[PDB]
């Protein structure tokens, strides 16, 4: 009777909010300090061990398509990329007349005219003298003027050579919230893209996330458990990309058989330009290998899960990209310090009706001048890497776009996408959510203050 | 028996200085036009003012010693050059120019104002030269020894403006930080300095347009029912005199020339927008002010000046005494095109013991300017397509005195602007910044229980 107002401090009440999360590097990455591109030297070291705290009898709503964590990640990584290019050389005087001729030393039928021997007049250490130099350039980096050739970037923007002392290895990074904020992780395994999460556990902050940039595929990502998960903002709408996750990873081997030597050319006082000197041995096209038995088995898992939403009678068929720029129609990634753009038409070619060393090869080319962030005016020239390169990756997902459209046909067409580069990072931040803590709360009870 | 008692939060303030942050509306933020003044980075303003009418309080004010105008002058200059870094700098434009007069449809009044210059220019390739031509005004070219060169070549590298950003002034609001307050005086009769019987406090100042002009105040706040004349020393001639109009006068400015922009492609990713041929007739830019309205506001101004100089003296108006084009002309911008108008036709009259004529003023256009009286800086305005027509209203004057050699019978007033700091005093004269001091001690008959 006559219950009075009582205020409690430190009550566990939270709601959604926005904040600027900070980095948290590992102990190993905080000791080498070998001038990483992502400026991990400034990043604070992380906690010695995870401090996950499980919450019982809690229900929380999640939304991976409107989460602001990916926007912060997307905004940051661009700034980190730009910051690492300022203190190294700028290739402003390379825009000059080029006389390029084909190389026919030990070429292959595939590499008929993929390499050009270009010679040009470049400035020496002295401003009053110019020395004739030569280099090898890929066809994708030279455009004919009318013979006479010139770099593609000359008429759009002059940009910086990729710095030679910096590395592009995607070391894991941890995104962590400041005081007064908490991160909630959804431990449910059937969480598709939205809904209450039966098991929500708060954590100190997110786990290691590798900033891998790829298109049409997800490389070195996270693996689902005992299920294949398909996530989309709106399955009915065909304009929304479809995200797939693999429980069992499939391995892809990519290599460059060509052996080339790096040659340094002095373009001015204190500035050096590294160019491909010569190729030792035969010249062959680069390619990637994917096991047919594993890929076909993985595709069988995908269609079974994908057939649930569109009907168990629907016929599933796959096709290559619908056309467009080289950045979207091909699979883009890096292996060391060289960037690939590979034709994956040999993977998405099947038709499903639903009643061991083939090593599917994906021949492809290599480009040196790249606009990674799909922005006009900021390119980069990656210097050649000495010797052959080899690397293996984990294919942990796909980005598929459905192009059915017509309602008069039962069969549905799925094609690889990759138009937006936020999808690669959204597939790893979907579990986490950011909330703020409000310690002030008022509850009624029986308590009085002495006069 | 009196004992010390302490109170926290008493309304006591003292004069001080602090850094004030910006406040802007959502009009420019939604459009995303990337203005020179970054409203997106600027803090959004309050939905409505929260002024409080204070009673029984008298506070001193001083616009001449006000520190707010110092911060506004520094901030605007800092914002001006912050937008010039991205776009191209015309470092290779210092070459030999072969210029010749144009005589197609030139009127005698503009016989030699603009030339036709041709010169070699660089391209993306560092081994090719292109021969192009552009039209430059006479004020921007000087004979080196025909051969001509830009005035900035022996001064500094001359950077041009970014075409995307616009120079149209937009209102801004100044807000005191936490723990500080701003006091506003609502007394209409309040002159430059003195106690204010009515004082009010606001969290953010009213919208202020950073219009830059000389000898004339354009698009500014007006007085109430009278014409206010403010000067830190009316007797001293060296101090400028500020005038505020109760009723504005409209001025029409236009550039009849119809020039075509030509984007000359130089360097990788760089662009130089030169002036092409003018189609049709070529005539000078001019500005009109109504003679009936202008003569009416002079009669109000002279009456106010009689109070501070006797009701029997003779007030005379004269044009600028002398100097360069910057200080002897009404400098302003109009739709991205800068103007330097000759205002000798306004201040030509005498008053003793007391029909749309549309007074026209010849004006000139300059491309290379020094915005803030600095040396070694440029802002090369790109040409604008079509004809430019902007309508503005004058809300004040800046005047200076001279002579006074013990002859108290005639007074001469001439236009003159020392700097743009006095330009913004007419808008910041009613605002001052004070800091709150919550702590206080008072005597009361009370103790502490032990």
């Amino acid at each position, epitope marked *: 009777e006559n219950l009075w107002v009582t205020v409690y401090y430190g009550v566990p009440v939270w709601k959604d909010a926005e904040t600027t999360l900070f980095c948290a590097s590992d102990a190993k990455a905080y000791e080498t300090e070998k001038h990483n591109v992502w400026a991990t030297h400034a990043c604070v070291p992380t906690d010695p061990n995870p401090q996950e705290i499980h919450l019982e009898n809690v229900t929380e709503e999640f939304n991976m398509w409107k989460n602001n964590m990916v926007e912060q990640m997307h905004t940051d990584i661009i700034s980190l990329w730009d910051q690492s290019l300022k203190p190294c050389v700028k290739l402003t005087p390379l825009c000059v007349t080029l006389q390029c001729t084909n190389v026919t030393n030990n070429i292959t039928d595939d590499m008929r005219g993929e390499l050009k021997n270009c010679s040009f*007049n470049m400035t020496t250490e002295l401003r*009053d*003298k*110019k*020395q*004739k*130099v*030569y280099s090898l350039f890929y066809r994708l980096d030279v455009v004919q003027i009318n013979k006479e050739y010139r770099l593609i970037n000359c008429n759009t923007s002059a940009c910086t050579q990729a710095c030679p002392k910096v590395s592009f290895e995607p070391i894991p990074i941890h995104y962590c919230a400041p005081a007064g904020f908490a991160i909630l992780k959804c431990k449910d395994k059937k969480f598709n893209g939205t809904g209450p999460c039966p098991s929500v556990s708060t954590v100190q902050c997110t786990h290691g996330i590798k900033p891998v940039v790829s298109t049409q595929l997800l490389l070195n990502g996270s693996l689902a458990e005992e299920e294949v998960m398909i996530r989309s903002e709106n399955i009915t709408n065909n304009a929304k990309n479809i995200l797939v996750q693999f429980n069992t990873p499939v391995q892809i081997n990519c290599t460059r058989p060509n052996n080339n030597t790096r040659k340094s050319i002095r373009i001015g006082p204190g500035q050096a330009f590294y160019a491909t000197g010569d190729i030792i041995g035969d010249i062959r096209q680069a390619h990637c290998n994917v096991s047919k038995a594993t890929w076909n088995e993985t595709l069988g898992k995908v269609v079974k899960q994908l057939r649930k939403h569109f009907g168990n009678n629907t016929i599933i068929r796959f096709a290559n990209s619908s056309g467009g720029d080289l950045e979207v129609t091909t699979h883009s990634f890096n292996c060391g310090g060289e960037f690939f753009y590979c034709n994956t038409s040999g993977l998405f070619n099947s038709t499903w009706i639903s009643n061991s060393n083939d090593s599917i090869t994906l021949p492809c080319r290599i480009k040196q001048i790249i606009n990674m962030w799909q922005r006009i005016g900021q390119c980069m020239y990656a210097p050649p890497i000495q010797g052959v390169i080899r690397c293996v990756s984990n294919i942990t997902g796909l980005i598929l776009t459905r192009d059915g459209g017509s309602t008069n046909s039962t069969t549905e067409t799925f094609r690889p996408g990759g138009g937006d580069m936020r999808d690669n990072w959204r597939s790893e931040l979907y579990k986490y959510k950011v909330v703020k803590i409000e310690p002030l709360g008022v509850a009624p009870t029986r308590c009085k203050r002495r006069v | 028996n009196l004992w010390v008692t302490v109170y926290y939060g008493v309304p006591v303030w003292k004069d001080a200085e602090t850094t004030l942050f910006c406040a802007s509306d959502a009009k420019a933020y939604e459009t995303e036009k990337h203005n020179v003044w970054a409203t997106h980075a600027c803090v959004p303003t309050d939905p409505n003012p929260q002024e409080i009418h204070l009673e029984n309080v008298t506070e001193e004010f001083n616009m001449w010693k006000n520190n707010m105008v110092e911060q506004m002058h520094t901030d605007i200059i800092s914002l001006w050059d912050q937008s010039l870094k991205p776009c191209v700098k015309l470092t290779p434009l210092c070459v030999t120019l072969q210029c010749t007069n144009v005589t197609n449809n030139i009127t005698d009044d503009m016989r030699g104002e603009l030339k036709n210059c041709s010169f070699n220019m660089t391209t993306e390739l560092r*081994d090719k*030269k292109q021969k192009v031509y552009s039209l430059f005004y006479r004020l921007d070219v000087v004979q080196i020894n025909k051969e001509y060169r830009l005035i900035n070549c022996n001064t500094s590298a001359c950077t041009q403006a970014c075409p995307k950003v616009s120079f149209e002034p937009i209102p801004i609001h100044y807000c005191a930080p936490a723990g500080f307050a701003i006091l506003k005086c609502k007394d209409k009769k309040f002159n430059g300095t003195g106690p204010c019987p009515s004082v009010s406090t606001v969290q953010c100042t009213h919208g202020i347009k950073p219009v830059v002009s000389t000898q004339l105040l354009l698009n500014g706040s007006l007085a109430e029912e009278e014409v206010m004349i403010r000067s830190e020393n009316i007797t001293n001639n060296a101090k400028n005199i500020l005038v505020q109009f109760n009723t504005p006068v409209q001025i029409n400015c236009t550039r009849p020339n119809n020039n075509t922009r030509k984007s000359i492609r130089i360097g990788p990713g760089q662009a130089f927008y030169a002036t092409g041929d003018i189609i049709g007739d070529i005539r000078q830019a001019h500005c009109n002010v109504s003679k009936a309205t202008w003569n009416e506001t002079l009669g109000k101004v002279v009456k106010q000046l009689r109070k501070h100089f006797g009701n029997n003296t003779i007030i005379r108006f004269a044009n600028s005494s002398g100097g360069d084009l910057e200080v002897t002309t009404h400098s302003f911008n109009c739709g991205g095109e800068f103007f330097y108008c000759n205002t000798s036709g306004l201040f030509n009259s005498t008053w003793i013991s007391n029909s749309n004529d549309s007074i026209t003023l010849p004006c000139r256009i300059k491309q290379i300017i020094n915005m803030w009286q600095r040396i070694g800086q440029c802002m090369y305005a790109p040409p604008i397509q079509g004809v430019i027509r902007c309508v503005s209203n004058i809300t004040g004057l800046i005047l200076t005195r001279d002579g006074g050699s013990t002859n108290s019978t005639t007074e001469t007033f001439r236009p003159g602007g020392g700097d743009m700091r006095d330009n913004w005093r007419s808008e910041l004269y009613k605002y001052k910044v004070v800091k709150i001091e919550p702590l206080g001690v008072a005597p009361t008959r009370c103790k502490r229980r032990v």
Partner: antibody
Amino acid sequence: ERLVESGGGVVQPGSSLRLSCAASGFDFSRQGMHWVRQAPGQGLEWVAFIKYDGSEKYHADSVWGRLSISRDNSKDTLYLQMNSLRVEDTATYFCVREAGGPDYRNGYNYYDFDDGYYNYHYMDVWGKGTTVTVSS
Amino acid sequence: SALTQPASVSGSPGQSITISCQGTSNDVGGYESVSWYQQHPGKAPKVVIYDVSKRPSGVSNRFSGSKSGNTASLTISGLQAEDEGDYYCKSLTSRSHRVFGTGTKLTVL
């Protein structure tokens, strides 16, 4: 700024011989050299030309595939090799330098590969030469 | 194809003489690279014309040369005793080879 030729002698037809030319006082690695032979009562005859780095070699049609020419910038010497000499092959061979210099365009000096010299298409300095005769 | 030259040219001192040296239009008039040389017994030949029509440093200014279409000639004004000797004309070929002319013998009266 001086060239000396040596290696003359008397050989039977069908034999082989080599002539050596040396350069001093100037850069041997930047300018190309020629080979000319003359006989009493006969005009000058051009034999061959070699570039500064020996990228390509030019030989006269009348002696095509007869005389082999090579140079060694490290040793600062020039070599002239001929095989199966004939009775008419006797002459006075001279080691001759071709003058060259940077090309001047747009205000700058344009050199060749590895800081080479563009030929100016005239001969300035000539060697004293050596006389050789063939007898059976 | 060797250049064709007159067998001999004679001229008294103080007069003006002309020497003809002709080959193929492509070889001579094509590459524009024409040179002239002067030789003395017991001495190597010395270049007398630096360019196709320009003299080098360290030579008398009396020498002069000209070209007219396919035809080119050398003119010497004010002949002297020291002008006696052998003269040759050299030019590049179409295939960047060097060809020597037949040669002309000069007789001083």
